[PDB]
Symmetry: D2
Subunit: 243 residues, 4 copies
């Protein structure tokens, strides 16, 4: 998270951390609990290639990474079939926990948006995670969960910015329709935040608008962060996650 | 280059080395002289973001990189307007040298394939370069130009391979039509070879069938090297390169 | 610490961590509280070149590094005047805190041994710290304080071991008289433990016999850990530290 | 070598490169040919621990590292029995080749100085090698042999400087008698040059005054380079190398 602040313990009850087996269960991506038994994340975090489930674990909200670990095993990894790379699209996936989780005010699910939600510019949205605080700058220990308010912009505006300083032809779509963009040169998500949630409060209810996907670097000029647009894959999600 | 060996001094007179300005003019990509004043290379080697010409130089046929350097300045970088990332496609670019080169028996152009030429799956082809000799392991000094015979494979059979051990839906194209693939678990091109040439001797004449583009790792199981199919962009090339 | 395990939080109340100013207050060495206002450590941790006090901080007994930080400023750094390199000797220093600490059962001083104490070979002693768990192997987060029981070795025997597999003449002293040594191929102190304490329980009382100094790798055959013999510099310590 | 230039082919015929077996025969130290079958180098380059002679080879003068390798095997490695660390002293060693080499104008031995040679300040000398061109700055390919004229200064002068900005007592000698000192903030030898030679033209004849040994960094303020004083170990050398 670029330009944020440590998040209060009472916020982002849905934030999760994905861990891969190694010298220690290291965090590689974020995600979000959307159901007692399901975690939503980015497909590039766990695919496109099939991985060994055993070498994967999920950590529920933690104020500081690695501090109070209580790792949960994963029974299933479900990656959107249309995915291959984040730039192309469909950067979304689901993780089924081996056992349901017990929710509480400190740990519970995030609300998914109705298929019609647009999240127009000027909407209050936040992104969270344990990613780098800047390009090539990792979050230093004790690794606090960070949060930053990001400005949402229209897809066509970001698409135009990505073409500035690029050879890519103006009519060749970069920021696609199943994507959503936010952030600026002071506020953005970064490496390590992938898979994490981008949420906005709409009428007193927090809705996950996106999943941290990609971007050219972090908080760089004319290169706002790109997120997978959740409303675009609601149907797919519901083919696995009950209402 | 993985699984090959040092190229005889008289082979591959078209191989070129791309250099970027730093503590020393370091190699970052390969290329091929397709005209006295034009170098064909991979777009991802010099884009999508605009580069500074001042920082680029071209080095012609060299037995050992950095040894007998005679850097040539570039006048213009033409990156196919449809290019954004290698996986998407149109990974091809042109480099117009500031002066034509005096071709010789030891250093001269390679012949482009005719628009109808269709390198049959199995064709004896060769790829060359100074790229890694294996995944994550560089070419050791004195950096000799390497070569390796690789078998060309049918696009469909390749696309199918890339889906093996992957979540990507079978009907979702990974190896696209403007691409070509070649190599196996023992022979392939690697990081450092990008933009380099994949040449095949057909009817007693060397034709450049492709440009080293991308691939999952090097010489990995069911992950053959992907190259930008040259025949596919012949018209775009000829829009700039004479005859 | 190689071998051994995480330390119960009621053990080693004198262990401290030295921090240096950077992106965060990073641990670079260990130490021990030998007086409410004095920390005993290794000279090579803070010299031979003069350092900037502003960039130094001391952290008292922590179960997991960086998690419950309460950095204490340092008012003086006294490096033994005879010190230049660890292999030469006199690898010992004193840090004078800016304020005495409120000792408790959880955090309090360790006892220096009497000038007579010798600590016989094959003595039950323990060394503690956050150093590497093995050669080139960092202590993984959450960075628990580790401990390991190591056997004291007679100086002559150590010096002798260090000559095995070496060109150094047998009569040339490697492990000097102001040094002490302990450990084996399974248990030892490692990079990051320097300045740390080596305590032994004598007559039912914990005394600091050594300060982690140097060694050839960690837990390597015929290469036991070398420590600055404390009894050898008691006089120097007591010139500054109240009896 | 810091602050020099590429050496002409006709100079430093005695310069040698030591190679360690690995992915390729990598340079790790310099040396000098003092006899058709003997090479003089630094003890810290090959000791204090005994090494596998098989994993070692010597390369005679080369204009560019790795390009014209003609590696020579070593039969014996003789290290001064007084050696343990460079700061302590006796940083000298001998390498006996398996076969005598053929001498010529391009490659021949260097003359050792008479026991009474002092090499007083003022008198210009040169140091050569393939080491770093600055602190943490590697010699770039094609790795040319560099040379640089260094100013020699009296031992007590350099010792005083080594004490500036250091806690080491002024009477604890740093630059020892068996050592020699040269270089300044713009001219010096650096990592990789170790074991190489420091030669001075005396009476029309070139004499090796020292062997690159150590220094705090390279070309740093009040930290001139330190070399092993050859005249101090003549007797030892002659116990092995014919007169
Ligand atoms: C993300 O935060 C981010 N950071 O790193 C990544 C890439 N990701 C690739 C897949 N990973 C692994 O190889 C290990 C798999 C562990 C595992 C084992 C067993 C089962 C399941 C899993 C983990 C690392 N992604 C950034 C966010 C950008 C924010 C900009 N505003 N995204 C990113 O870097 O994207 C592009 C990308 C994609 C793939 C590789 C490199 C770069
Ligand atoms: C290639 O060998 C390869 N290796 O690295 C690359 C990526 N390339 C990106 C563009 N580069 C730069 O940003 C620096 C530009 C310097 C410059 C300055 C001024 C003017 C002009 C230039 C250089 C590095 N490509 C591999 C070969 C695959 C072999 C498989 N069998 N290709 C590859 O990695 O492709 C996919 C890809 C595409 C873009 C980025 C990363 C990866
Ligand atoms: C020690 O654990 C150890 N680990 O690292 C070291 C070396 N030490 C050098 C001095 N340091 C710094 O440069 C930073 C100074 C920060 C500072 C700023 C401002 C004020 C005060 C301080 C810190 C790192 N020492 C091992 C233990 C060996 C155990 C074997 N069983 N010892 C070691 O490595 O010793 C030899 C040595 C000495 C100096 C350098 C390298 C190696
Ligand atoms: C020297 O140029 C220098 N450069 O590197 C070194 C250290 N040396 C350590 C031992 N080496 C090896 O591990 C490989 C052994 C190969 C081998 C195989 C088989 C048989 C025999 C040998 C080689 C590298 N020393 C500098 C000169 C400084 C000049 C300043 N004006 N000296 C230096 O760096 O010294 C301190 C030092 C010592 C050991 C490690 C790091 C630093």
């Amino acid at each position: 998270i670029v330009g944020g602040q440590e998040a209060p313990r009472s916020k982002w009850p849905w934030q999760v951390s994905l861990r891969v087996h190694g010298p220690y269960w290291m965090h590689f991506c974020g995600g979000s609990l959307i159901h007692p038994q399901w975690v939503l994340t980015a497909a590039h975090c766990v695919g496109p290639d099939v991985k060994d489930l055993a070498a994967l674990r999920v950590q529920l909200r933690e104020q500081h990474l690695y501090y109070q670990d209580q790792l949960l095993p994963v029974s299933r990894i479900i990656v959107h079939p249309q995915f291959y790379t984040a730039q192309i699209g469909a950067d979304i996936a689901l993780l089924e926990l081996e056992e349901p989780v017990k929710v509480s005010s400190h740990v519970h699910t995030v609300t998914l948006p109705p298929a019609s939600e647009t999240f127009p510019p000027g909407m209050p949205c936040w992104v969270t995670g344990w990613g780098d605080v800047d390009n090539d700058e990792r979050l230093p220990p004790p690794f606090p969960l960070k949060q930053v308010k990001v400005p949402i912009m229209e897809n066509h505006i970001c698409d135009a910015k990505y073409h500035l300083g690029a050879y890519t032809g103006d009519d060749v779509r970069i920021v696609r329709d199943d994507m959503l963009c936010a952030g600026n040169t002071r506020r953005d998500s970064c490496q390590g935040d992938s898979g994490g949630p981008l949420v906005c409060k709409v009428n007193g209810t927090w809705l996950q608008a996106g999943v941290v996907s990609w971007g050219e670097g972090c908080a760089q000029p004319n290169r706002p962060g790109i997120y997978t647009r959740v409303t675009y894959y609601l149907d797919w999600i519901h083919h696995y996650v009950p209402k």
